[PDB]
Amino acid sequence: EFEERVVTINRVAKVVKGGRRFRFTALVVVGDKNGRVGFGTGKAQEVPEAIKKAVEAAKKDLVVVPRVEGTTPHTITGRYGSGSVFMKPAAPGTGVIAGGPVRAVLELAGITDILSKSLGSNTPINMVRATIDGLQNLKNAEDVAKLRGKTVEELY
Amino acid sequence: RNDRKVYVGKVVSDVLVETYKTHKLYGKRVKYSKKYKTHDENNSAKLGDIVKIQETRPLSATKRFRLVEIVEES
Amino acid sequence: TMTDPIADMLTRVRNANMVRHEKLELPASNIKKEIAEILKSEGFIKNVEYVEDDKQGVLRLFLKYGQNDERVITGLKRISKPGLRVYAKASEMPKVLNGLGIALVSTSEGVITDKEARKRNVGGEIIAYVW
Amino acid sequence: ARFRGSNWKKSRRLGISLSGTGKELEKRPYAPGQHGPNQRKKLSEYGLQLREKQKLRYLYGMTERQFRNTFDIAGKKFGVHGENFMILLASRLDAVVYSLGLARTRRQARQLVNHGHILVDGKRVDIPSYSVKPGQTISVREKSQKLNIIVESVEINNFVPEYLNFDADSLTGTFVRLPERSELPAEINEQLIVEYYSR
Amino acid sequence: PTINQLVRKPRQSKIKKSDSPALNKGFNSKKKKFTDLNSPQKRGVCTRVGTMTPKPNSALRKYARVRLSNNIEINAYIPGIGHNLQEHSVVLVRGGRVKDLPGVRYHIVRGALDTSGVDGRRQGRSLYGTKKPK
RNA sequence: CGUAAACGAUGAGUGCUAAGUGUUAGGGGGCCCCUUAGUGCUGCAGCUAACGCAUUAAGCACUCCGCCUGGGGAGU
RNA sequence: GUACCUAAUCAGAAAGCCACGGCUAACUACGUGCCAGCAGCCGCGGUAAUACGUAGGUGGCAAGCGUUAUCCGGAAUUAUUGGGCGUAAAGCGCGCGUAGGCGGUUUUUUAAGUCUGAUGUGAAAGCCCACGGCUCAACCGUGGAGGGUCAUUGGAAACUGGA
RNA sequence: UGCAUUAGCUAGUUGGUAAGGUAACGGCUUACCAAGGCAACGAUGCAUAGCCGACCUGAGAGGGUGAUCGGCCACACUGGA
Numbered sequence A: 001e002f003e004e005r006v007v008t009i010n011r012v013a014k015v016v017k018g019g020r021r022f023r024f025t026a027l028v029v030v031g032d033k034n035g036r037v038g039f040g041t042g043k044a045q046e047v048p049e050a051i052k053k054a055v056e057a058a059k060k061d062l063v064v065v066p067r068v069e070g071t072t073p074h075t076i077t078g079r080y081g082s083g084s085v086f087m088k089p090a091a092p093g094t095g096v097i098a099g100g101p102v103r104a105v106l107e108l109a110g111i112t113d114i115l116s117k118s119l120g121s122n123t124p125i126n127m128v129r130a131t132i133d134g135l136q137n138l139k140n141a142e143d144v145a146k147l148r149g150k151t152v153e154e155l156y
Numbered sequence B: 001r002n003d004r005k006v007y008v009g010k011v012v013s014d015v016l017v018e019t020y021k022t023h024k025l026y027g028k029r030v031k032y033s034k035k036y037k038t039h040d041e042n043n044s045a046k047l048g049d050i051v052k053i054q055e056t057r058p059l060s061a062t063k064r065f066r067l068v069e070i071v072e073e074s
Numbered sequence C: 001t002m003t004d005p006i007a008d009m010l011t012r013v014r015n016a017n018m019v020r021h022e023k024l025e026l027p028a029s030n031i032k033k034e035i036a037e038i039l040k041s042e043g044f045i046k047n048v049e050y051v052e053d054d055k056q057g058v059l060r061l062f063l064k065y066g067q068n069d070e071r072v073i074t075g076l077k078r079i080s081k082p083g084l085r086v087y088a089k090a091s092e093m094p095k096v097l098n099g100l101g102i103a104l105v106s107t108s109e110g111v112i113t114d115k116e117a118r119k120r121n122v123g124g125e126i127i128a129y130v131w
Numbered sequence D: 001a002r003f004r005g006s007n008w009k010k011s012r013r014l015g016i017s018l019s020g021t022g023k024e025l026e027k028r029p030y031a032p033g034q035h036g037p038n039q040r041k042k043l044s045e046y047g048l049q050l051r052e053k054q055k056l057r058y059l060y061g062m063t064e065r066q067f068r069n070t071f072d073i074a075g076k077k078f079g080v081h082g083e084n085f086m087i088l089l090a091s092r093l094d095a096v097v098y099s100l101g102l103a104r105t106r107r108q109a110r111q112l113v114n115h116g117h118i119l120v121d122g123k124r125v126d127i128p129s130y131s132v133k134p135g136q137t138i139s140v141r142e143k144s145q146k147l148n149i150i151v152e153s154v155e156i157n158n159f160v161p162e163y164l165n166f167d168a169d170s171l172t173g174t175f176v177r178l179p180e181r182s183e184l185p186a187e188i189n190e191q192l193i194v195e196y197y198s199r
Numbered sequence E: 001p002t003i004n005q006l007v008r009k010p011r012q013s014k015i016k017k018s019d020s021p022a023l024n025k026g027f028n029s030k031k032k033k034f035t036d037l038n039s040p041q042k043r044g045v046c047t048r049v050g051t052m053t054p055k056p057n058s059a060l061r062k063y064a065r066v067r068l069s070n071n072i073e074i075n076a077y078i079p080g081i082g083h084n085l086q087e088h089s090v091v092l093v094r095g096g097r098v099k100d101l102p103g104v105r106y107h108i109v110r111g112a113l114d115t116s117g118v119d120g121r122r123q124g125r126s127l128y129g130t131k132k133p134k
Numbered sequence F: 001c002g003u004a005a006a007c008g009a010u011g012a013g014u015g016c017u018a019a020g021u022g023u024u025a026g027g028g029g030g031c032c033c034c035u036u037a038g039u040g041c042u043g044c045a046g047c048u049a050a051c052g053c054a055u056u057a058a059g060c061a062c063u064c065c066g067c068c069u070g071g072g073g074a075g076u
Numbered sequence G: 001g002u003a004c005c006u007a008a009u010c011a012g013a014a015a016g017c018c019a020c021g022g023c024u025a026a027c028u029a030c031g032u033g034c035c036a037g038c039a040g041c042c043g044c045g046g047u048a049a050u051a052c053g054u055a056g057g058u059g060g061c062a063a064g065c066g067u068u069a070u071c072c073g074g075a076a077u078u079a080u081u082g083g084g085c086g087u088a089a090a091g092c093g094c095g096c097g098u099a100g101g102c103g104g105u106u107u108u109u110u111a112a113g114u115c116u117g118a119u120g121u122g123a124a125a126g127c128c129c130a131c132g133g134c135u136c137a138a139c140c141g142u143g144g145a146g147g148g149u150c151a152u153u154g155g156a157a158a159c160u161g162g163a
Numbered sequence H: 001u002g003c004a005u006u007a008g009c010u011a012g013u014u015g016g017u018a019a020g021g022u023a024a025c026g027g028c029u030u031a032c033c034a035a036g037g038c039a040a041c042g043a044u045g046c047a048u049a050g051c052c053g054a055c056c057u058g059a060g061a062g063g064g065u066g067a068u069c070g071g072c073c074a075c076a077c078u079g080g081a
Ligand SMILES: [Mg+2]
Pocket: none
């Protein structure tokens, strides 16, 4: 099944002729820790109801993260708007060296070993979108060997 | 025996030995030049000639080189 | 005016690749011919043709796209530049994309890849990264 | 020892039986103090890595300065850092004496070493942090081979781990080889401790 | 900028400024000149003790006017409930500005030199110069 | 004298990257088709914080120059 | 008569410091009533204060624990690695033009840059790895490694430079 | 190492000849002759500073420091011999 983590709960307001009308925004990452991760958002006056909406929306945009023995195939920087996340493969002994919402995304993907630095906006939604962007652009050796028409050994 | 330093340059008064100093931080090569007051014996060379010089014992307050050979005439 | 014909070639490829063109033409030079052949040999592009003319020659390149029209070339990047030339030794040859990409190096044994430069124990000018 | 306070209070707060038996988390498996029965909220990310570190540290009974120094020592050898750390802690003469069965509790094994009742390879070792190597021999000093603490502990023949060899009649032990992560306590997620010292 | 521009005009980092400038200066009496030394505290004499009102906050915050050993005049806050200070008191002054009090950038050390410890303090005594009771 | 919201609030040079449609000055071919160089509008890819820009880029690149490094104090 | 060793006697002489609203591990009561005070930031206190003071409890450390000062980091916040300039700070009002920077295609040549070996040198101590002695550890010792834009010398010739 | 909100500096100065002088080369000194020499690749002036191995920090690139140990220099109340 899919584990989920509540990255951020934000109380937002819209102004009306009376006072202010408040709602709650939940940003949630879902993942199975086996190479499938996804994020979603939901909004409600109640915190738990916003979480469930965010969880449901996350399941519709799961991504396939290439991995090699628990680490990424190569360095990449994921960028979304002002968010930008540098991700680098690390040795199996190393843990997830990540700061905030990056850690939630990488852990629920099943990384356990990575060197990551958030170089940009620390706004959680855009940090999360940047992280997914970088994982969306990783390429495993078997895939790039197929496009170049060589075998995996000839790549090296 | 032993070798004395040799330079090639152009006469700027009757020797300029322009070299490159690579930038410590940025890695770009920057041209720099140093004037080598040299001993010409019988005033043989003239302005703009490209000459070869060799290091010697001090000959005056600032002369430490002797003009050995003229390479490209003015 | 034109200052880097090699970076102009790498950018012509990048722009044509962005819009998934089948082929592109550019004026020729010896190093651009040799860069193009290495891209063919490494499997990044399909074919290279040389068209003779009176001025300087023409290089015709044929781009490669996989199933579902996915681009074989992901990116090109000029490394050594007229404003700042980049050289490397065989012991410090850069790997591109953890080995999944290539670096084009101009060495005293010609223009070759980074994987071959370490094999031959030669360094030289890092022309570009292709991945 | 160093910390001489209630090990029952520490086991309840950390949620790990320090005695290794479970009699501390028996009636009150909740934190000590006034707000014990009142159930608190979740633990933060920092509060989870920190609680893992205190689990290990209070099990082996070490101060934070010595604990962090052992972590740095363990991080220099080839292999997985967190596992090398767990192996190094198990090799303490403090913990070897207890694992062999010469003392009832880990605190009793400390006072025996500290008071000079223990020999290593035939010579007296007074230092509880002594790092026993494989092949070494731990025994009891002659004037102490008949003491009630050692005698009573030995007759309760518990599971002496497979990286150790003990001879009850000889009152002598052997450090056969380096333990493996499976032979070491499984209630400690050491990956959290490595993260704790990364921030 | 371009590499050539950087070679012509290299980068320059912003110069950091000190929050306690009166502590980082000495005075040589013989040469009548100012030094630069980075002291952690400075001795001084109270010129005028008194009170001052804060900038949302409202109180009568106790302070002293101090001439430091380097002949610099500063306003120093007196922490804790009650103090024994007056004119001509010899005080030790440390860093740390008190917000809501404009122009007071330093603290008086309780329990050092002539300043007494806070009376009746039982928690955090070492911050207020109070000996352990009983 | 030497300053203006001296503004496209967009430095110069060079090349490459869908289309559609007005207009100014030409050219080639059969009023239309093609083609140069300007000047406008709309609009992909791409870029952008957004607004928007988009072959007259704010896209993709290389070269050189000028400039920026929180607000006030103070262009004192 | 030091280290050390041996024997006897006694748990008897040997625990403090800061914190507990969020960042940030750890909360209740009483007193106070925008006062007294707190404060690194957000800010707290104007009669039901987890932020003031005390108490109990708890957390973090521990022969130390806190505060101040100073330096690097976090700071990609001077950005070579690694940032920008339409409206956020930032294109000189605009030419002409000097130095400088940069510069289209090919062949031959050179060998300054570039690459690749050799030799010498870069003391010792230090850092890092290994081993040995200190009961352990600090520490000490031994053997290696590293550190040059270094010099001299032999090769290569694609690129930059020279002809 | 800063400062161009420091742009001109030098007249034994720069070169030559001779003599003197020194352990030694040399404007090192003197005499005579010539008008050179330095500088926007920052001369000169002002301010600051003993320098290095090392040390602290940093992923690194860098940034910061020179107490202790070792190498080199300079000084010995101030100035001249
Ligand atoms: Mg303007």
